[PDB]
């Protein structure tokens, strides 16, 4: 169970580690997150008191190397920083411990939320959608545009989602215009799943990544990745069974976390209304379709 | 964006623009079967691609033979016009191509926009005119040669005969869509008064009658009273 130990908290932010947020008061003797889960990638993502503009945070798998958060007052944000001295990091840690000045990670023994939100996602993979290679771990805001959003401006501070559009070149085949329009199993099975994605498990990381990040921070151009993803799929008349069975289980959780006031602004009608009700899959999802029509019946 | 009232003048200028309209695509007749359910037959289709300010109509034949065999008719009709527009596109030399091509039904923005994905610099628009371009198959010469054809052909016209040369394409505009709102809304009566006097003939290489620019205008008028006398009927009004 690893720590991220915080050098101080001098301004007042709700702190977010994953599904879970605490508000830490202006120099309330804060010094971080303990008994954080082995094996997930994580996010430590913050929204400051003063100013809730710019949501933002860090992703991180503490089997990479020790982090810890210390505020800058110069660009005026917590920062994720690595420890490379492990002894010096130990015995930070160590002593937050022994004068109890850390949040556990508050993870309810039977709760699979968390594993069910990332299955897919791995480190790796944050880190080429986030570029930033002399860091082991990945900044997001809210403001971060994505690939797609800036081809229609500081490619450096880009989302690198995987471009999908359903009238381009690359989403229709000369001579299928139609076909490959009305059925996109084509651009779904051949361009995105055997060409770009290499396999299921990698197009559903970046399906998962692109939900958390829609939700954790607002990001309108994850959101837009995130439902892209899904029509692609349901819109394919030819989808492997273990995938229909893994996306139903995959968007059961990511509407089950949503906060339920925020389903105006982070689910989009005609997408949803098209997967559930008229795709090729709308009887392929039936988790999902009982989640929303429980949940959100207003939506649909 | 959408062409409407606002930007009318733009069909006029020096930009190479087409309208296309599907509505002559795919024709049926409704019948009832032996066992009295209902049942569609095919008759020959068009596609109606105009140069509204040349007058060029490009009258692609579509023979019953294309939809031997295939299912959801009204569905393919649509891509089967865009498929054949592009063809169209592609034949042409570059220097005549279209910039602009605007579809008189918005259901044939997507399909026409798929098709033409390698003219990227093509724009594909979208209409607020209700134009009459339906009512095409009331020109005769035009229902001869679609009803006539035996296998897929392109037939080249213009529709506005030699009215260029007295009128501009702005005029020449109007007076079409005039003839074809008329025969749209009584083709019994349009038809009455443009051969009532048979004097006035149809030229082997025209459309429409050699009328004089006095004729016109008399023609003109009994036009938009049809359409009105017409219309104090449909509205009760």
């Known amino acids: 169970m690893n720590t991220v130990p915080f050098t101080s908290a001098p301004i007042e932010v709700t702190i977010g580690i994953d599904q879970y947020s605490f508000n830490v008061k202006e120099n309330q003797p804060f010094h971080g997150i303990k008994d954080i889960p082995i094996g997930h990638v994580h996010v430590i993502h913050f929204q400051h008191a003063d100013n809730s503009s710019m949501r933002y945070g860090y992703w991180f798998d503490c089997r990479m190397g020790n982090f810890y958060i210390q505020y800058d007052p110069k660009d005026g944000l917590y920062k994720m920083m690595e420890e490379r001295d492990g002894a010096k990091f130990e015995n930070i840690v ?42 082991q771990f990945s900044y997001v805001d809210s403001s971060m545009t994505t690939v797609q959003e800036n081809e229609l401006s500081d490619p450096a501070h880009s989302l690198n989602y995987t471009v999908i559009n359903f009238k381009s070149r690359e989403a229709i085949r000369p001579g299928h215009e139609m076909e490959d329009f009305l059925d996109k199993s084509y651009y779904l099975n051949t361009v995105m799943l055997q060409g770009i994605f290499k396999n299921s498990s990698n197009y559903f990381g970046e399906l998962q990544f692109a ?33 229909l069975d893994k996306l139903d289980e995959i968007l059961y959780y990511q509407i089950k976390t949503l906060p339920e006031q925020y389903s105006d602004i982070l689910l989009n009608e005609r997408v949803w209304n098209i997967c559930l009700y008229s795709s090729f899959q709308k009887n392929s999802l039936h988790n999902t379709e009982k989640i929303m029509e429980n949940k959100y019946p207003e939506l649909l | ?48 691609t105009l140069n509204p300010k040349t007058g060029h109509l490009f009258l692609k034949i579509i023979h019953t033979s294309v939809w031997a065999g295939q299912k959801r008719l009204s569905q393919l009709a649509k891509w089967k016009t865009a498929e054949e527009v592009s063809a169209l596109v592609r034949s042409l030399p570059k220097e005549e191509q279209p910039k602009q ?24 628009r979208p209409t607020e005119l209700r134009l009459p371009f339906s009512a095409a198959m009331s020109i005769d010469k035009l229902s001869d040669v679609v009803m006539k054809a035996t296998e897929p052909q392109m037939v080249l016209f213009n529709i506005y005969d030699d009215w260029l040369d007295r009128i501009s394409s702005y005029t020449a505009f109007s007076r079409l869509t005039l003839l074809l709102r008329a025969l749209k809304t009584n083709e019994e009566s349009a038809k009455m008064i443009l051969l009532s006097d048979p004097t006035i003939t149809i030229k082997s290489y025209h459309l429409w009658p050699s009328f004089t620019d006095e004729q016109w205008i008399t023609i003109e008028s009994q036009m938009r009273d049809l359409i009105l006398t017409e219309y104090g009927r449909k509205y009760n009004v």
């Open chain 1, 211 to 243: 939900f958390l990040n829609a939700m954790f921070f607002g990001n309108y151009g994850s959101s837009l990745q995130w439902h892209a993803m899904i029509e692609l799929i349901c819109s394919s008349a030819t989808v492997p069974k273990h995938m």
């Open chain 2, 1 to 48: 964006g959408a062409m409407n009232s606002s930007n009318y003048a733009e069909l006029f200028n020096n930009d190479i623009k087409l309208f296309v309209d599907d509505t002559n695509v795919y024709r049926v007749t409704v019948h009832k079967t032996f066992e009295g359910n209902v049942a569609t037959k095919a008759i020959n289709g068009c596609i109606f």
């Open chain 1, 94 to 135: 160590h002593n937050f411990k022994e004068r109890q000045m850390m949040v556990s990670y508050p993870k309810i023994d039977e709760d699979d939320t968390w594993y069910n939100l990332t299955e897919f996602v791995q480190m790796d993979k944050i880190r080429k959608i986030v570029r930033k290679d002399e860091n």
């Open chain 2, 101 to 124: 091509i605007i579809v008189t039904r918005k259901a044939m923005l997507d399909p026409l926009e798929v098709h033409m994905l390698d003219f990227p610099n093509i724009a594909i």
